[PDB]
């Protein structure tokens, strides 16, 4: 018996074109350019969810750094003080504290200056 | 169609009962005057072909 | 080792017969595959690029036209060209071992015997060719048509009467085969067809 293409390729092409909605020009209209665009897109997303973890840690550190310098110390000495005090509040919560709860962050700075 | 027996192999070689391939030693067809009796004598024996070459030759003898 | 119910005017007797105690599903599968493969017509066919109607002319020069190189338009890369490795007329039959066939036969009957679905009869009371006659006989024999039945008998008049029933498949004893046995939910045989069967698995 014969098994012509039939519906199979149209359906595969529509899956890809649907994933490419929003892309510029032929990158959402052409099956071939959409597939090429999605190859890159998938690698980027993988690489960038690794990268997002670093992006945010960088932001926390910068905010923590400015909070510290309002109390006369820098980030590196602050972090070292926390390690000697045994305090394990992470940088995500420290940066939240630095903004949302300045009296608690001021205390944490105290513990850190005193732990050295 | 069915394989043909290779007749150059069939005229040079034998498959033994256990599937080894046995041939005549080379080197005593001529130029023998100055060859020691040891060389002439031991070249009168059969020898077992090395396994890679024996496998190929057996495929040429599909009905032995 | 099997007790097979018989249907007699005198009454439901019991005949004993030794059939294979073990049913081998894979073996019955091999027999049915053989039966279904050997009946294949093998009439699918296509045309190679040599069998297609076009000239063998090279359609345009090898070089310097700016087009891709081509030979004749029968090549399978052309719409309307020959087909690559298409089907050709083909014999699907093969010689399944006789002992496998005979053993498959016996197992297939054994399988129905072990389910209680094998019934032997001496005679078909008054069925002489009419479907209505066999229907009456069937009802009294417990064949109310709720189960498909393979009817094996050398009596032509019985086969002609049952054969138009949607739930009956009719065979002469020399045509007993395992695909037809497995197709149907019940086996119903003449004592005469039974002996032919016994002669063949012997």
């Amino acid at each position: 018996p014969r098994a012509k293409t039939g519906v199979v390729r149209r359906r595969k092409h529509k899956k890809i074109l649907k994933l490419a909605k929003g892309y510029w020009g032929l990158r959402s209209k052409s099956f071939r350019k959409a597939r090429e665009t999605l190859f890159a897109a998938g690698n980027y997303a993988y690489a960038h969810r690794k990268r997002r973890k670093r992006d945010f840690r960088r932001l926390w550190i910068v905010r923590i750094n400015a909070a510290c310098r309002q109390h006369g110390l820098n980030y590196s000495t602050f972090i070292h003080g926390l390690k000697k005090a045994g305090i394990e509040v992470d940088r995500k919560n420290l940066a939240d504290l630095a903004v949302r709860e300045p009296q608690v962050f001021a205390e944490l700075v105290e513990r850190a200056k005193a732990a050295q | 169609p069915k394989m043909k027996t290779h007749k150059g192999a069939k005229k040079r070689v034998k498959i033994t009962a256990s599937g080894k391939v046995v041939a005549m030693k080379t080197g005593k067809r001529h130029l023998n005057w100055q060859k020691s009796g040891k060389e002439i004598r031991q070249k009168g024996r059969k020898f077992v072909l090395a396994k890679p070459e024996a496998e190929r030759i057996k495929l040429l003898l599909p009905y032995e | 080792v099997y007790q097979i119910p018989v249907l007699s005017p005198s009454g439901r007797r019991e005949l004993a017969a030794d059939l294979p105690a073990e049913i081998n599903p894979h073996l019955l599968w091999e027999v049915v595959r053989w039966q279904l493969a050997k009946r294949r017509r093998g009439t699918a066919s296509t045309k190679t690029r040599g069998e297609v109607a076009y000239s063998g002319r090279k359609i345009w020069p090898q070089k310097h036209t700016g087009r891709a190189r081509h030979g004749d338009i029968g090549a399978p890369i052309f719409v309307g060209g020959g087909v690559v490795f298409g089907p050709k007329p083909r014999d699907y039959s093969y010689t399944l071992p006789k002992k496998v066939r005979k053993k498959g036969l016996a197992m297939a009957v054994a399988d129905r015997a072990r389910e209680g679905k094998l019934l032997l009869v001496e005679a078909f009371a008054g069925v002489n060719g009419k479907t209505k006659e066999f229907l009456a006989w069937a009802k009294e024999a417990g064949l109310d048509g709720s189960e498909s039945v393979l009817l094996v008998t050398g009596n032509e008049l019985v086969r002609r009467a049952a054969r138009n029933l949607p739930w009956v498949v009719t065979l002469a004893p020399e045509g007993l085969n395992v695909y037809d046995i497995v197709r149907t939910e019940r086996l119903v045989m003449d004592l005469d067809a039974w002996e032919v069967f016994q002669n063949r698995i012997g």
């Binding site: - | 290779h6 150059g8 192999a9 005229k11 040079r12 070689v13 041939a23 005549m24 080379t26 067809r29 072909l49 070459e53 190929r56 030759i57 495929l59 040429l60 | 049913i23 599903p25 894979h26 019955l28 599968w29 091999e30 049915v32 399988d111 497995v182 197709r183 939910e185």
Partner: protein
């Protein structure tokens, strides 16, 4: 048991290897052929059993030996097939060439020769020849060696 229960045993009906059908399969593109040789081409290599790339082959450097025959060919002469005593242990009374052919022991068109592997039993065995040991054993066991012509 019914048609929808008919199944090959596991491993009885294996799927084929389909090459040149995409990256996921492991067999796409070059179709397990590698890159760019004579072996990759449709048509492929010269017969690997013999050809060795132009050098004089392993086989052809070996010497011929023996009679190979001549036209008009094979000389008709009587041929013998040996049948050991052990293979006669199932017969009773009298064994002869035609009996051994029927039992699947002797091949048609072959004279019978009895050989001495195994033990004899008191049988009248008719044959065209006997090994020396097969005569010894058959006599000692109470058999009757009947030589044919």
């Amino acid at each position: 048991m019914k048609l929808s229960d008919l199944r090959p045993n596991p491993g009885a009906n294996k799927r084929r290897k389909r090459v040149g059908r995409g990256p996921g399969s492991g067999h796409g593109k070059t179709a397990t052929r590698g890159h760019k040789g004579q072996k990759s081409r449709s048509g492929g290599l010269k017969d690997p059993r013999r050809f060795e790339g132009g050098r004089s082959t392993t086989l052809m450097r070996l010497p011929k030996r023996g009679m190979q025959g001549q036209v008009p060919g094979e000389i008709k002469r009587p041929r013998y097939q040996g049948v050991n005593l052990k293979d006669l242990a199932r017969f009773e009374g009298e064994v002869t060439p035609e009996l051994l052919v029927r039992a699947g022991l002797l091949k048609k068109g072959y004279r019978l020769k009895i050989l001495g592997e195994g033990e004899a039993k008191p049988l009248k065995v008719v044959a065209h020849a006997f090994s020396k040991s097969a005569l010894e054993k058959l006599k000692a066991a109470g058999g009757e060696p009947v030589l044919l012509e």
